[PDB]
Structure formats: structure tokens, C-alpha cells
Amino acid sequence: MRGALQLWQFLVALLDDPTNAHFIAWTGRGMEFKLIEPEEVARLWGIQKNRPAMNYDKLSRSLRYYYEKGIMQKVAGERYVYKFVCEPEALFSLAFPD
Amino acid sequence: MRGALQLWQFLVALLDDPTNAHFIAWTGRGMEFKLIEPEEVARLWGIQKNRPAMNYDKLSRSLRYYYEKGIMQKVAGERYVYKFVCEPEALFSLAFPD
């Protein structure tokens, strides 16, 4: 994975592997996913990026950048639940993560 | 765009720009798109890849590889109409076009 790997790509790599479901999982509702252990997801992102001071406060800023741009949505009334947006315009952003 | 740009990424770049709608367009039904001028799409792909003998016969092999793998679907009873699949597993394939 490249130095400029997107958080969203890293999350999808984690989500694709059901052996990770103890800390992050597709919920089964469409493109919805849950961060079951948010600080563990952040720790793993820190390892990926060689940023040992990574934490969920930091990681969550990027989730918010994604949902403000309509690439993800934050699921209302839930904690730590997000979804990928299924839409022509969002797909362009995904197609060109660089 | 990198030497290893995927056809699907190239198509999304074309589709994102509505000034291309005379040869390729999102149809408005979800993630469905139509190749209005299939040989023009192929000509442009040939330019992108410096493959001047490109044509739609060749390009369409890749569309078929994508739909056989469940990354796209071919729309039944239609000519030149495809859709991107909105699904956890397909998204992993999109996330890692390399």
C-alpha cells in the first residue's frame, strides 16, 4: 500500500477481511460499517502510516471530511456507524484516491 | 493518470464530466451508464493508453471481465448499458485498482 493510501481504502481493506470483525465490520445493511473498537482501528492506521501517536480523535476528522463531502454518510442516532455512498459523483472521488 | 489506470477508472472520469454525454453518460438510474458511442469511448481509451489499434471489441472484453467478477453488471435486454455494483466486496476491488 502506497504512502498516500487513503484512510477510506485502509478501512475497506480491514472491512473486507471478516477476521477483523472484532474491531471493524460491515453491518449487513448495504454499505454500512461499524467501528467496534475505534481506538484499535486508529492504532492499526497509525501502524500503516508510521504515525505512532495516531488515535481515534485524529482518524475521525477524516471520517468527517469524507461525510461532509458526501463520500460517506454518518448514520444518525448511532455511535461509530458510517456508510459509503452509492452514487455517480462519489464514485469519481473513490476512483481517483490520488 | 498512471500507466496502470484501470478501464473502470477511465470510464468514471469520462462519466463524471457531463460534457461527454454525447458518447458516454450516467443514465440516471442508480449507477447505470450507457456507451452512446462505443467506438468513440474505445478511441479515447486508446489515446489514454497509447494503443492506437484500440476498438470496442477489445474494450468490451474488459467490461465482461468486470461483470463476470461482479464489479459491474451488464443490463439485460439492453445494448451498451452497464452498472457499477454497490456492494461491500465490489468496493474492495475498486479500492485497490492496483
Residue numbers in the entry:
A (entry chain A), B (entry chain A): 337 to 434
In the authors' words:
The Ets domain is a variant helix-turn-helix (winged helix) structure, comprising three α-helices and a four-stranded antiparallel β-sheet. Here, we present the crystal structures of the Ets domains of the entire PEA3 subfamily (Etv1, Etv4, and Etv5) together with the structure of the Erg family member (Fev).
Crystals were obtained from constructs that contained the Ets domain, Etv1 (encompassing amino acids 326–429), Etv4 (encompassing amino acids 338–470), and Fev (encompassing amino acids 42–141). Etv1, Etv4, and Fev display the typical fold of the Ets domain, which contains three α-helices (α1–3) flanking a four-stranded β-sheet, with an additional C-terminal helix (α4). A comparison of the structures of Etv1, Etv4, and Fev in the presence and absence of DNA allows us to identify conformational changes that may occur upon DNA binding. In Etv4, in addition to three residues Arg-397, Arg-400, and Tyr-401 adopting different rotamers, the C-terminal end of the recognition helix switches from a 310 hydrogen bonding pattern (which is the form adopted in all the other ETS structures) to a more canonical α-helical hydrogen bonding pattern, although in this case the difference may be due to the fact an ethylene glycol molecule is bound in the vicinity. Analysis of the contacts between adjacent molecules in the Etv1, Etv4, and Etv5 crystals reveals a conserved potential dimer interface that is distant from the DNA binding surface and is present in all the DNA-free and DNA-bound crystal forms. Dimerization of Etv1, -4, and -5 is mediated by the homologous cysteine residues (Cys-416, Cys-422, and Cys-449, respectively).
